[PDB]
Amino acid sequence: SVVISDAWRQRFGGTARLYGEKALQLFADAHICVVGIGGVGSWAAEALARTGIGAITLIDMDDVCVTNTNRQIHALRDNVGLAKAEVMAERIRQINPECRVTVVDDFVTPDNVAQYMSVGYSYVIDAIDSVRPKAALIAYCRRNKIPLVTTGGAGGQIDPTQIQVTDLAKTIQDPLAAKLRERLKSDFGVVKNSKGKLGVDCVFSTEALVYPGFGAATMVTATFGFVAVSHALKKMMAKAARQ
Amino acid sequence: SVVISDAWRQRFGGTARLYGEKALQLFADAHICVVGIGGVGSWAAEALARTGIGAITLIDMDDVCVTNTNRQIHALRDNVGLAKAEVMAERIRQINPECRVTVVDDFVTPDNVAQYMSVGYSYVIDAIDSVRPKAALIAYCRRNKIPLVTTGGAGGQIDPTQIQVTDLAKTIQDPLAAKLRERLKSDFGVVKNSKGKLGVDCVFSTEALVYPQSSGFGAATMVTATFGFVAVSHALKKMMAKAARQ
Ligand SMILES: Nc1ncnc2c1ncn2[C@@H]1O[C@H](COP(=O)(O)OP(=O)(O)OP(=O)(O)O)[C@@H](O)[C@H]1O
Ligand SMILES: Nc1ncnc2c1ncn2[C@@H]1O[C@H](COP(=O)(O)OP(=O)(O)OP(=O)(O)O)[C@@H](O)[C@H]1O
């Protein structure tokens, strides 16, 4: 459904060499949504674009702030005060002019989550920090079998080598992930499996949290983003191989 | 000491909250050199800037090519055909206008390495791909006790969770590192000591290589950038430890 141009092949030849032609087409035909374009999600957006994903949706309504500078790819002096999602969309268009980027200038809420998630995404990357919306987002994708990867807390951590993906039920050292399980259970009835799983893939770190509200670093928060994207692409490729 | 301005505190207050106030100033006073502004070094540079490093030198003479798009932070439509180091420098100035950024529009060679490393860097991040000059750079820094972190090959890899740090003698699934060791031996007589170590810290991955599909190894942002990020984290950690020891 995207006809790969010669220019696209120039941009993404390295992607073809790594994942294969079938994968290159799969990515070019994919539509991935990132919700929250902050210290995790902005790097996830970047990585999507640089891996030949053919359509990307970004959901956020916040502006670039100078305090974002330590950990968000869109935080540059001339961007300050502009909407994070539009700034990122403009950058994606510079990475891959043929990528179809949509900006939703809104916050996902429990009342609008169904209408936004129901578009038909290949994958959803959840990089929101507010717990009530995040729980609602995860609950919705999970019930509807919308492929999702969610991300735990990326602040207060210095070691990018401790980042990994596991079922949301098995995360450790992560109070955000913990409070999410709580909310899922009580407000959406989401609960453990036969196997002790919630069936929700989560990027988290095993690192014990560093208290000074938390600080953050690019090397860690970006790696959350990148690990979420690589997890998604792996799943998508495994699915495409199966059928 | 570099004076930390109120604007600096606005940009990097998150850094101070994570690493502490002493570290904020250590980073502001630091001068770190990145050699090779590509799949790994471009993201190393980005990360140094966003962590409040006060001086950064960038060494490369290559230009931004459209084929860099899959894995280099400076590869955008408008930059194609410009010098990588200059493009990256301009971006660092947008991240932190008070960072002092030096561009060396050249390649490191066995004949210029001493002059370029004679500067007194806090740290050197070696992200070059060419094995002969890579050996020359590493051998120079090692002999001179210049703090350095190198990396092996970042291509042919899809899993950013397998990246970690070991001594250069101990890397696996990394033809580049292997050649590098051969060249260190053959050209600088640098060889393993009694404990099996070269005394060179190297970012590598345990991942089995993914060979060319569809003309050398491919690469992805998610992995090559994480190489650079793990290099920066390692360097900052070592710098903080040496400061505390002192
Ligand atoms: N319900 C929501 N829908 C979409 N995006 C959201 C929602 N809630 C939060 N976000 C966004 O998620 C991102 C979270 O990013 P991150 O945690 O790094 O921190 P930030 O909010 O930019 O920083 P700070 O904590 O300093 O305000 C932000 O860009 C934020 O605007
Ligand atoms: N002797 C050297 N000194 C400084 N930089 C170097 C040296 N040799 C190579 N480099 C730089 O190291 C970086 C390596 O990056 P990377 O391996 O991603 O390759 P690239 O050269 O942009 O890719 P390709 O040439 O395969 O398209 C490049 O920007 C390159 O110009």
User: Which of A70, A75, A227 is the closest to B160 by Cβ?
Assistant: A227
DSSP letters spanning A25-88: HHHHT-EEEEE--STTHHHHHHHHHHTT-SEEEEE--PBP-GGGTTT-TT--GGGTTSBHHHHH
Contact: A71, B14; criterion CB under 8 Å: yes
B1-246 in CATH: which number? 3.40.50.720
Question: Which of B11, B162, B217, B221 to probe by mutation at the A interface, max A CB count within 10 Å?
Answer: B221
Task: Put the strands of the sheet holding B201-205 in their side by side order.
Answer: B100-104, B55-59, B31-35, B123-126, B148-151, B201-205, B163-167
Please tell me the experimental approach by which this structure was elucidated: X-ray
Superfamily of domain A1-243: NAD(P)-binding Rossmann-like Domain (3.40.50.720)
Class of residue B175 by CB neighbours under 10 A (exposed 0-12, middle 13-18, buried 19+)? middle
The CA distances from residue A98 to A32, A102, B246, in Å, are 15, 13, 54
Contact: A219, B161; criterion CB under 8 Å: no
Ligand 2 atom nearest to B154, measured from its CA: 17
The CA distances from residue B132 to B127, B176, B228, B240, in Å, are 13, 11, 21, 31
What kind and span of H or E run contains B150? strand B148-151
What kind and span of H or E run contains A104? strand A100-104
| A25 contacts: CB under 8 Å, gap ≥ 6 | A2, A4
Q: Roughly how many angstroms between the first and final C-alpha of chain B, as a whole number?
A: 17
Place of tokens 């793990």: B230
Question: How far apart, in whole angstroms, are the C-alpha atoms of residue B103 and residue B85?
Answer: 6
Percent helix, strand and coil across chain B, each to the nearest 5: 45, 15, 40
The CA distances from residue A195 to A167, A191, B22, B156, in Å, are 11, 11, 47, 34
- DSSP lists the bridge partners of residue B118 as none
Residues with CB under 6 A from ligand 2: B 35-39, 41, 59-60, 62, 65, 67-68, 84, 107-108, 128-130, 133
Contact: B19, A50; criterion CB under 8 Å: no
Question: How far apart, in whole angstroms, are the C-alpha atoms of residue B193 and residue B157?
Answer: 30
DSSP label of B52: T
Domain boundaries, chain A: 1-243
SS3 call for B154: coil
User: Which of A156, A222, A230 is the closest to B229 by Cβ?
Assistant: A222
Question: How far apart, in whole angstroms, are the C-alpha atoms of residue B108 and residue B105?
Answer: 10
Closest residue by Cα to residue B232 from B21, B52, B17: B52
Among A57, A60, A103, A137, say which to mutate for ligand 1: greatest number of ligand atoms within 8 Å of CB. Answer: A60
| B216 contacts: CB under 8 Å, gap ≥ 6 | A17, B155
Question: Which of A218, A221, A224, A235 to probe by mutation at the B interface, max B CB count within 10 Å?
Answer: A218
Closest residue by Cα to residue B74 from B53, B95, B104: B95
Backbone angles phi, psi at A81, to 5 degrees: 85, -15
Closest residue by Cα to residue B27 from B56, B7, B6, B63: B56
The CA distances from residue B38 to A107, B61, B62, B103, B193, in Å, are 36, 11, 9, 15, 32
Among A65, A128, A183, say which to mutate for ligand 1: greatest number of ligand atoms within 8 Å of CB. Answer: A128
Closest residue by Cα to residue A42 from A82, A67, A70, A71: A71
Torsional sign, CA B196, B200, B201, B205: negative
Nearest chain A residue to B156, by CA: A18
Question: How far apart, in whole angstroms, are the C-alpha atoms of residue A41 and residue A45?
Answer: 6
